[PDB]
Write a protein that binds this ligand. Sequence first.
Ligand code: PLM
Ligand code: PLM
Ligand code: PLM
Ligand code: PLM
Ligand code: PLM
Ligand code: PZA
Ligand code: PZA
Ligand code: CL
Ligand code: CL
Ligand code: RU
Ligand code: RU
Length: 583
Amino acid sequence: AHKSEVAHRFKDLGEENFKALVLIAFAQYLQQCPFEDHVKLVNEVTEFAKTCVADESAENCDKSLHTLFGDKLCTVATLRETYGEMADCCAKQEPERNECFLQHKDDNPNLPRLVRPEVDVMCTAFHDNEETFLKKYLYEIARRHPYFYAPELLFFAKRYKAAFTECCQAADKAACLLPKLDELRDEGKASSAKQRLKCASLQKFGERAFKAWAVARLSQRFPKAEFAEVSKLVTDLTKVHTECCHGDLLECADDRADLAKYICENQDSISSKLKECCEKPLLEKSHCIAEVENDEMPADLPSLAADFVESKDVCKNYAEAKDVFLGMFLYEYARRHPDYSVVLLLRLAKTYETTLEKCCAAADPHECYAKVFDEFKPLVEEPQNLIKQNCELFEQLGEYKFQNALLVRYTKKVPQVSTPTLVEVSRNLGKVGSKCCKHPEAKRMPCAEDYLSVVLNQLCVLHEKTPVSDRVTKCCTESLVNRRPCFSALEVDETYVPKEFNAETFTFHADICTLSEKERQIKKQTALVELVKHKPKATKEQLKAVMDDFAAFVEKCCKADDKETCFAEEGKKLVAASQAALG
Ligand SMILES: CCCCCCCCCCCCCCCC(=O)O
Ligand SMILES: CCCCCCCCCCCCCCCC(=O)O
Ligand SMILES: CCCCCCCCCCCCCCCC(=O)O
Ligand SMILES: CCCCCCCCCCCCCCCC(=O)O
Ligand SMILES: CCCCCCCCCCCCCCCC(=O)O
Ligand SMILES: NC(=O)c1cnccn1
Ligand SMILES: NC(=O)c1cnccn1
Ligand SMILES: [Cl-]
Ligand SMILES: [Cl-]
Ligand SMILES: [Ru+3]
Ligand SMILES: [Ru+3]
């Protein structure tokens, strides 16, 4: 507690960081207000912040930040004209005014797609008015993502700024800058997805489920920490995410800072990997800690047999505290297996738990549960075999042809899915192969889990809204621990009725060779989906004949002069012989 809280935040973050976070905070609430407006409110709270720094006993400096924030929100003159119900929050008072404001945040504002400008425009606006360009751009992101944790948006923003500084003075501005922006775009979207997955888990599956996840990951993170230390970090982390899911930025930020400060005070009890994280400023501490790599596990850990199979007090220790015993099992297993995904560890714990629920009520428990560790081999191998098979495929073919292999397989399993959705799922899954199959076997499964979890929640909320399959709803509503296996065991839909032929879908023009490699790829892949949707009985060799003839057709009908006529002349020739090769 401090005499002036807005003073302590200004001194702590610094001016630049303050201005950026104030702009993000208000943009997330006044999503429909113009950029000029937010500039004027930021300058006004920034000047007020400084008077409180100069003298903490100055007027209004003693008020709380939630109160300061709501006060400024309520001095907006148009606020009833454009926000309406939000205006009535101003007639309440603290703390109900604050929670009223949170209720009236609109996750899905009806704002046009933020169009990427031309690289030379952006670089020129960059060079000529760095501030306005960066902040206008930052305002336009924050207003469209109002629930994206504000200091993480600033961490993403500062990387965008580094990409412009490096790339605007480069030889090929475009070749330097588009991969980086695309790189950042996906990452910010993966962060958004991870945040909502965690909240959604907390609300549907409960605290206990969430807690078992955190025990696994935390024990992988800090394998030399003691169970009691990890369990405290589990209880603190749950409180943090419970608060952060609720939406109040300042309360979520204090919970994260408090937890990071606790970790930094107890590095010896936690991990030897946090020294440099722990001398970063408050702004970066919890972010840095959250990204630090696992610590080394202790050298000669014993096997788990002693405590969890061979010991005689198994049923006694379990029954006196089922959750604490299971979490101790989870902690010992997860600290030993940084190569496993969290979900596969949770499967193991769920198998152990099911085993003791029936063994510990039986004639003699120990024979009943003597070989439950055997039941871990199949659960371990299924994911590791999936990674093996698919990383071999990615090297045999390439990203594009691995994406095309997945396109055919997933289109055959669930052909009711939109062609555009099928295209982007299979393409984003080729990119996960590219980044994870490049790790050794010992880090592939954690990497996959991290990215597949983004693709599956993304695909799921598209399903919740415009669903298309009952089997997908089953996969999207089941336990988060089982959601990837459920999708993996989706069988090829043999109930599917083929799609009628449409001659346009498989007719191609000269724009195909006047297109970007991406746009050409998306076009060819869109048609590969439609070929499977019209002929789902086609084999991979029957499809390769059609695909090999297509590629030669476009390499022949774009090296000629009357390319436009070849596309219809020889396009009618390839279509016909394709429909004779199939069906
Ligand atoms: C009247 C001003 C209100 C606006 C202030 C909003 C942002 C203040 C601080 C934001 C987060 C800073 C601390 C981050 C903590 C963490 O994530 O570890
Ligand atoms: C915003 C993404 C992660 C949220 C981080 C919450 C507070 C971080 C403080 C230290 C946490 C260390 C790692 C926690 C995440 C994990 O590995 O399960
Ligand atoms: C039934 C699926 C739910 C999600 C996965 C559950 C696996 C069972 C393991 C429960 C561990 C108990 C929570 C530990 C918290 C603590 O240490 O206090
Ligand atoms: C509206 C979109 C929802 C339906 C989309 C379902 C498409 C299935 C693709 C899921 C990918 C599964 C990831 C791993 C599965 C496997 O190993 O085969
Ligand atoms: C070299 C790029 C990889 C392969 C590109 C895949 C293109 C698949 C679409 C070709 C369909 C041609 C025949 C039409 C279908 C029909 O008539 O039944
Ligand atoms: N509204 C409050 O009670 C409050 C407390 N601490 C910081 C900010 N706001
Ligand atoms: N010119 C603009 O208003 C603008 C905004 N955001 C990005 C790019 N340009
Ligand atoms: Cl622009
Ligand atoms: Cl611009
Ligand atoms: Ru602009
Ligand atoms: Ru899995």
